[PDB]
């Protein structure tokens with residue numbers, strides 16, 4: 037009945053607990069101490085962190101709870117606008133953009149993005165093929181180069197050309213800095229004035245490039261296999277309306293901000309777990325060699341990479357790279373038969389803890405075992421939620437998993453990997469999670485592309 | 486390219502090769518002679534037996550192959566209906582029952598069945614505690630009493646009371662006789678001498694239908710809720726169609742649980758105890774775990790999950806003698822198997838599981854040795870090398886039920902008794918729909934630990 041709560045700091049309540057560079061991992065440790073639910077208070081804010089499948093399955097009842105904009109998402113909305121990820125469900129532009137964009141994110145739609153995904157993936161493989169002996173790979177750095185360029189190409193047929201650069205394209209630099217400012221604002225006024233000025237400058241950089249490309253495309257009339265073409269031509273069946281140019285810009289910004297980092301983090305975590313578990317690596321590499329028999333992988337071949345998909349799902353279980361999502365009670369309701377909630381009360385779903393609920397997964401929750409996902413029928417409802425919940429779940433789920441399966445498959449086909457530093461897992465936190473400083477050596481298998 | 490085929494008998498092709506009391510073991514010997522794939526032809530039938538992990542990993546590609554009803558499963562369908570095990574993947578009632586029943590067979594659902602499993606397990610232990618000196622145990626007989634009663638209790642809250650009987654409950658007698666008739670039909674053709682078998686077959690079907698239909702009706706009239714599969718099926722709805730199972734299909738599911746689950750599971754327990762008494766060092770390690778883990782008079786669900794080495798013992802017993810010895814597949818489209826065997830759409834495959842599990846390229850040269858340590862890490866075992874529970878979405882829905890039951894019972898057996906192979910038993914594997922060690926007997930000396 038009475039809800040646990042971590043230590044307080046006088047008038048600041050629990051807020052200083054987030055004044056750390058690893059806040060999700062701090063919240064996980066608190067959940068370990070306090071259990072399936074704890075209250076978290078800040079000045080002008082009350083929320084409750086959920087960690088058990090028992091309670092999270094109720095929170096995922098869409099008749100009782102709707103998506104809430106966390107403070108992180110509210111600050112991201114200052115540059116992602118009413119794009120899909122930072123809109124309320126009841127805003128006209130959410131359902132409109134949802135209806136228009138859903139068919140362009142389906143599994144069947146991945147057939148049309150596949151060639152562009154292969155384009156960037158081959159660039160990644162060629163980079164690693166061209167490394168000199170005993171040079172090494174900066175894994176999250178290269179994975180982020182790949183995912184940003186892939187979303188850039190598939191999103192609006194624009195080449196960031198990240199593999200030609202040490203300093204990223206100015207759009208990416210502003211994007212990363214804007215995300216950092218949004219997340220840094222959480223932990224916090226006269227000293228912050230330069231941050232505010234830079235933030236507005238970074239917003240302008242992103243808007244100017246995306247607005248320019250949209251305008252360029254409308255003037256040219258060119259049709260491509262990208263999401264921008266789909267949005268310029270699509271109409272919502274419900275309203276009969278297309279997306280306007282401002283919302284199209286916010287969607288493109290959203291694809292980049294919401295999709296690039298979770299996906300590069302997943303690839304980096306997956307390669308981390310592979311090099312730490314050589315038996316799993318061998319099994320995954322066998323499949324990649326058996327399935328990817330052509331110099332360029334086909335769409336159908338990627339779907340056959342079953343064990344690679346199991347590797348990726350188990351990596352998402354241990355370290356879901358979007359670590360939380362927020363909900364609010366649509367009306368007064370009782371959670372778990374003992375926690376009465378009032379209309380509008382907020383909940384946070386702490387995904388890494390859900391994925392460690394021993395009542396669902398057994399005692400070996402900390403072990404990396406892709407075989408847990410060998411038969412997807414064994415996974416209970418709402419025990420595994422790396423892509424969120426319900427109608428507000430990740431629209432890019434099929435995109436992310438096709439991208440990651442293709443790239444991981446090509447990596448395992450073309451290289452043997454060495455954990456030459458015996459890397460100690462160090463998880464950097466931004467809006468997302470990724471393994472900082474993860475480096476490997478790759479010895480080519482000398483298979484042509 | 487060219488596929489081997491065993492010896493033929495003119496117009497009967499390979500069919501007389503199955504006219505034997507031990508057809509799986511005959512097929513294993515054929516695989517030893519012919520290799521990883523051979524064609525097997527009968528009048529109106531062509532299939533291909535696969536024995537290597539190299540080829541079976543491709544056969545398990547669900548994008549290329551779907552479950553086929555073997556002739557055995559087609560004959561079992563005459564009393565198991567469109568229950569889960571004898572229905573095609575494309576039948577509306579397969580996906581419907583699959584979606585409904587999957588949560589009631591999860592590892593989490595075993596927590597709710599545990600008390601009923603303990604109920605029958607305690608009856609088994611008490612039976613053996615009450616034996617007089619130099620009496621012995623008929624192992625497969627007692628294991629089948631246990632598994633049938635356990636499925637009866639967990640399936641529909643019905644007590645067969647097998648430990649109170651020499652003659653089993655009439656449903657069980659009809660069930661066994663129906664399974665025997667289905668398997669006997671394979672070797673036959675159906676001329677006048679077999680007319681009597683048809684008449685018995687229908688009477689046995691009526692016996693099973695009448696009892697199961699009666700219990701369903703009793704439960705609906707009572708409105709009582711139990712912790713059994715029947716209550717779950719009376720109240721469950723398929724999330725996809727929104728429909729519940731009808732009363733006829735619920736009956737077929739209950740019959741399926743008994744016919745499909747009892748014999749494979751009792752066979753596993755009997756084979757496991759056989760291998761333990763034939764390998765005393767392994768038995769000692771397993772008994773040491775049971776004594777260390779089962780510290781209470783009655784095992785808990787959490788304690789059963791802690792019987793790690795017992796679980797490896799069971800998996801290694803399933804490796805050597807998978808009690809459901811085969812499953813059948815058909816090609817969804819034209820495809821090439823292993824880069825050299827072209828298959829046309831609809832072509833059939835049989836997966837010969839005991840031969841798969843003896844693939845030396847996977848397990849090493851010591852394939853015939855009983856070494857539970859092979860299963861210490863599932864990540865070290867290659868894909869599709871170990872398939873005692875079938876494959877994919879048509880895999881055994883009762884896998885967690887079977888392994889929880891077998892782990893609980895074997896753990897209790899090892900805690901409470903020392904076992905003697907007093908006859909130096911010679912392995913003799915009886916073949917029905919399933920495999921089991923016929924005539925396996927032991928003596929049990931009680932450790933005198935109270936329940």
Ligand code: HEM
Pocket residue numbers: 103120121122134187290291292294295296298299302356357358360361362421422423424425427428429430431432433435436
């Ligand atoms: C491993 C990769 C990914 C993970 C783990 C992930 C995770 C998530 C999660 C948890 C949510 C729900 C957020 C909430 O409820 O507040 C979400 C929403 C969303 N994601 Fe992803 N995502 C991934 C990849 C992508 C990609 C590649 C894209 C775009 C190309 C994308 C675009 C979106 C969008 C637009 C939404 C909002 C959907 C809506 O509310 O209508 N994501 N994602």
Ligand code: HEM
Pocket residue numbers: 552569570571583636741742743745746747749750753807808809811812813872873874875876878879880881882883884886887
């Ligand atoms: C050691 C014990 C067991 C073994 C070795 C075993 C083996 C198998 C195999 C190999 C299949 C696939 C058959 C095929 O593909 O044609 C299967 C399916 C099935 N088994 Fe078991 N089984 C065991 C225990 C059980 C139990 C205890 C139950 C029920 C309480 C059960 C119920 C089923 C059902 C319903 C199916 C069909 C599932 C579907 O296709 O949807 N089994 N079993």
